[PDB]
Coordinates of C-alpha atoms in Angstrom, one line a residue:
X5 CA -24.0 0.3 7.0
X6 CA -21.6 3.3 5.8
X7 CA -18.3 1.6 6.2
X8 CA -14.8 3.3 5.9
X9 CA -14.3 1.7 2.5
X10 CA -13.4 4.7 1.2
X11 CA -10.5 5.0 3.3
X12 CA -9.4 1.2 2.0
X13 CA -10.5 2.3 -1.3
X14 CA -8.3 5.4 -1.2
X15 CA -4.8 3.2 -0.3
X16 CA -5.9 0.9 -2.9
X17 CA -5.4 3.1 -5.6
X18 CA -2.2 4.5 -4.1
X19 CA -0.7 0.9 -3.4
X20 CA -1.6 0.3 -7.0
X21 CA 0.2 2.9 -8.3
X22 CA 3.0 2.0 -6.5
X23 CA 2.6 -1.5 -7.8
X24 CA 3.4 -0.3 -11.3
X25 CA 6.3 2.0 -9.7
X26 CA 8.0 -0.6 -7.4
X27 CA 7.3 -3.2 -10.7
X28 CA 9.5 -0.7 -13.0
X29 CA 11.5 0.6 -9.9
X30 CA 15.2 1.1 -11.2
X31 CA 16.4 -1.9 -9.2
X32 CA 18.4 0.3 -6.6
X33 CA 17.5 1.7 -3.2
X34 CA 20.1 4.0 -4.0
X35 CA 17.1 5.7 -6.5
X36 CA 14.7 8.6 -5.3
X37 CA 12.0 5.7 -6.3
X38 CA 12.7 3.7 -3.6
X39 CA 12.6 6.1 -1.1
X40 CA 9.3 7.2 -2.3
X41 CA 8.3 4.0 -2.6
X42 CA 8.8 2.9 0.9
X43 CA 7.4 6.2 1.8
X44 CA 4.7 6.8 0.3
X45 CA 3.8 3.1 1.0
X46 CA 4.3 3.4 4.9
X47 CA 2.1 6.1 5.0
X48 CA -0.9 4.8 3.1
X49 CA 0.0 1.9 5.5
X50 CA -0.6 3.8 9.1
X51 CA -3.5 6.0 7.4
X52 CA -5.5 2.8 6.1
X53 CA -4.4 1.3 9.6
X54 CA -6.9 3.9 11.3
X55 CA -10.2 2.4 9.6
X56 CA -13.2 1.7 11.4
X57 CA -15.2 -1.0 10.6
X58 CA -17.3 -1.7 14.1
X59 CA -18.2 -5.0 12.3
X60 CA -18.5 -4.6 8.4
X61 CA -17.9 -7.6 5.9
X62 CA -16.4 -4.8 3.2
X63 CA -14.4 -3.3 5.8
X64 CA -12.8 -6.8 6.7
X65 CA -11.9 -8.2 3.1
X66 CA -10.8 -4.8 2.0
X67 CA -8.9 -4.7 5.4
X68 CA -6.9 -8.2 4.7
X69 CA -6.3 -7.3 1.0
X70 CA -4.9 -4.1 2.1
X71 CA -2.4 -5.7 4.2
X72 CA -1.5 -8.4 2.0
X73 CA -1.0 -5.8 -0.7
X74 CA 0.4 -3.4 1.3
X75 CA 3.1 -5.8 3.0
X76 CA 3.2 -7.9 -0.4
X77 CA 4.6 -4.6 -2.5
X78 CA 6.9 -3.9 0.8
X79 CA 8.5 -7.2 1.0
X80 CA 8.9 -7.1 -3.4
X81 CA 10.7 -4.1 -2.9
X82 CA 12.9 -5.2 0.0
X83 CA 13.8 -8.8 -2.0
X84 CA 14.2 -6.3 -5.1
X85 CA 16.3 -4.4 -3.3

């Protein structure tokens, strides 16, 4: 069942980086990091958005996680700034 994992996968990675990045972020929005941050966050956000799963178990818990994380590293940076 070849599912779009990879694409989930793939943001993963990215939102973890940005994890580390919005964890050490200055504490500004007034910083490059920030708007980076947001950035490269909203992107990985509509790209990960276009996965198909058609019914795959992986797709689905990678798909919630991604959210969560996603919206969970959003909403940090928004209350940290």
């Amino acid at each position: 069942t070849p599912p779009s994992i990879k694409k989930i996968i793939h943001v993963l990675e990215k939102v973890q980086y940005l994890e580390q990045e919005v964890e050490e972020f200055v504490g500004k929005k007034t910083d490059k990091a920030y708007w980076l941050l947001e950035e490269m966050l909203t992107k990985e956000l509509l790209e990960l958005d276009s996965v198909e799963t058609g019914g795959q178990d992986s797709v689905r818990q990678a798909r919630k996680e991604a959210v969560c994380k996603i919206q969970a590293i959003l909403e940090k940076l928004e209350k940290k700034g």
